[PDB]
Amino acid sequence: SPKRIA
Amino acid sequence: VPRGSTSEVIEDEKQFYSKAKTYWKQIPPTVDGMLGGYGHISSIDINSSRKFLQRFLREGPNKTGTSCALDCGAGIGRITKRLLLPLFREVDMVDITEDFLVQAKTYLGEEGKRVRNYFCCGLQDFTPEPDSYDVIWIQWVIGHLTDQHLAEFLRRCKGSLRPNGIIVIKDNMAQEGVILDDVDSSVCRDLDVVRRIICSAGLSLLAEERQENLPDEIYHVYSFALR
Ligand SMILES: Nc1ncnc2c1ncn2[C@@H]1O[C@H](CSCC[C@H](N)C(=O)O)[C@@H](O)[C@H]1O
Numbered sequence: 654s655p656k657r658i659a
Numbered sequence: 660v661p662r663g664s665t666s667e668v669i670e671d672e673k674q675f676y677s678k679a680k681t682y683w684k685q686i687p688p689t690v691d692g693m694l695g696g697y698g699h700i701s702s703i704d705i706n707s708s709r710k711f712l713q714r715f716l717r718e719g720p721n722k723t724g725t726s727c728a729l730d731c732g733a734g735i736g737r738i739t740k741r742l743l744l745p746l747f748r749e750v751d752m753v754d755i756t757e758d759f760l761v762q763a764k765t766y767l768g769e770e771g772k773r774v775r776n777y778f779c780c781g782l783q784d785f786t787p788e789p790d791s792y793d794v795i796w797i798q799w800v801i802g803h804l805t806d807q808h809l810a811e812f813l814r815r816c817k818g819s820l821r822p823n824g825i826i827v828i829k830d831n832m833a834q835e836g837v838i839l840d841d842v843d844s845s846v847c848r849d850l851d852v853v854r855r856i857i858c859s860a861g862l863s864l865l866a867e868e869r870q871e872n873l874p875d876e877i878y879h880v881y882s883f884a885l886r
Pocket residue numbers: 654679683692693694731732733734735736737738753754755756759780781782783798799800803804
């Protein structure tokens with residue numbers, strides 16, 4: 654999915 | 660030194676695939692589930708994808724047809740519903756998660772009667788029929804394949820394109836290198852890595868576009884049109 658940059 | 664291949668970041672390939680399967684089995688079969696808590700961005704995404712795709716549907720020698728599309732990692736059919744069904748006579752879906760394809764039959768409603776094949780399979784195990792698809796749409800799933808399996812899948816996709824057909828990849832891109840997410844069991848690759856893999860598959864770029872109007876905090880998303 655689209656996701657927060659780790 | 661950044662990593663340039665999945666073989667630098669995947670400890671155990673069988674576990675990389677098995678953990679991802681378990682992960683998706685426990686995600687709700689909803690748009691918000693498909694988008695990782697970002698269900699709200701779906702309309703921004705679909706509008707952009709539509710504009711991107713329409714560039715290839717113009718009349719002329721190279722016009723992409725509108726008989727059949729393949730939605731890869733389709734999930735419940737978010738993209739099938741809003742982008743592909745309106746533009747293609749038929750659509751096939753492929754996804755590893757059976758519960759999503761079952762949900763799709765409800766989610767897609769009456770228009771879903773034009774979904775022809777629901778393939779429940781990993782992309783790494785899927786060989787699309789030769790000469791079958793005008794558009795092969797691969798969105799938010801390439802990070803679930805190893806580099807070797809991604810290259811191989813793209814080769815198989817090339818063989819399944821109708822004359823004038825295209826493959827579209829739309830996915831998360833890393834600023835640099837190849838980054839493992841060990842929770843969903845996926846990787847995020849930089850643009851150079853993805854382009855390398857595309858080239859390895861015997862494909863060329865027709866167009867590349869960054870997705871605009873996304874939340875600042877998420878990975879950048881790019882679309883690539885290939886043949
Ligand atoms: N190896 C694999 N082969 C095929 N599908 C996979 C896969 N690994 C994960 N998936 C599927 O990838 C999807 C990621 S969520 C994104 C869904 C859809 N592309 C959309 O943008 O709405 C899930 O439906 C999940 O089941």
